[PDB]
Design a protein around this ligand. Structure first.
Ligand SMILES: OC[C@H]1O[C@@H](O)[C@H](O)[C@H](O)[C@@H]1O
Length: 292
């Protein structure tokens, strides 16, 4: 049989890299993998419906990145009861809710997202120096576990830092236009803002455009997360200050490998057993300076 992967979306580069990484790993393992996302973008109910349709196609295993912590709880529990080998990718499902629903997953593969936020905020703190300044966080969608961890890690770092004042922490729901809108509002209400940490690059690129439109490119630091090509290009060009790169290809490849390796014991993970927890490294991408 084959394996299935349900991602948040296939239109955005972070997730496209994850799909490509899954396929590269499938090519090394010699397994067949179908990778999907639901047509309605960001629709948690559409993604549930997609998951439910796949869970009835006799896949050996399904890896999934849920759009929210709760939207896939019931169909994941249902698949576990059917003996499906399940791997949570990237964004943490509500595991206590999953257990209450009667299910489990073999593994969760993710980035240390508290560390991501701490790195993004930490680089801002380093770049602002002793004088510090007003900073803001553009959050992902409220309640998404990975985004929440980044907000926590950044907020904690900013709170401890001398002369840093976090003046705004606001969701833009992983959306570039909405992040441009939120950044425009922050720039209007906080004309002394010195830096904005953004929970992903889709948002950071919108923020960078708001900063440019305000004539403030280089005057307001903009840090993203994911490391998508356009953000790495923005960092090179000075349009973004940095981005905390993730490795979506490795997240996907590792999740597929865990799903394949899980079947060797001939049974899905017991209900009372803790899933595997596999961290994939992040890396701060800054403007490459070799000039003394
Ligand atoms: O889909 C929006 C975002 O979801 C997070 O959970 C992922 O780690 C990436 O940052 C992605 O860009």
């Amino acid at each position: 049989k084959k394996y299935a992967v349900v991602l948040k979306t296939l239109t955005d580069p972070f997730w496209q890299s994850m799909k490509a990484g899954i396929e590269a790993e499938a090519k090394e393992l010699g397994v067949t993998v179908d990778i999907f996302a639901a047509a309605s973008e960001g629709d948690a109910e559409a993604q549930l419906a997609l998951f439910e349709s796949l869970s009835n196609k006799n896949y050996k295993g399904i890896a999934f990145a849920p759009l929210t912590a709760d939207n896939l709880v019931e169909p994941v529990a249902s698949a576990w009861k059917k003996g499906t080998y399940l791997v949570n990718l990237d964004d943490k499902i509500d595991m206590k809710a999953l257990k209450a629903a009667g299910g489990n997953v073999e593994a969760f593969v993710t980035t240390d997202n508290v560390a991501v936020g701490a790195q993004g905020a930490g680089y801002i703190i380093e770049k602002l120096g002793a004088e510090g300044g007003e900073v803001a966080i553009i959050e992902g969608e409220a309640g998404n576990a990975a985004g929440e961890a980044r907000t926590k890690g950044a907020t904690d770092a900013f709170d401890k830092a001398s002369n840093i004042k976090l003046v705004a922490s606001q969701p833009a729901d992983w959306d570039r236009a909405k992040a441009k809108q939120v950044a425009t509002d922050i720039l209007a209400k906080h004309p002394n803002i010195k830096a904005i940490y953004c929970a992903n690059d889709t948002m950071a690129l919108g923020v960078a455009q708001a900063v440019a439109d305000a004539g403030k490119t280089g005057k307001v630091l903009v840090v993203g997360t994911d490391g998508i090509p356009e953000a790495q290009q923005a960092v090179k060009a000075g349009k973004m200050t940095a981005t905390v790169a993730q490795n979506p290809a490795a997240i996907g490849a590792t999740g597929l490998k865990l799903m394949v390796d899980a079947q060797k014991k001939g049974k899905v993970i017991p209900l009372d057993k803790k899933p595997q927890y596999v961290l994939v490294a992040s890396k701060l991408v800054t403007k490459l300076e070799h000039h003394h």
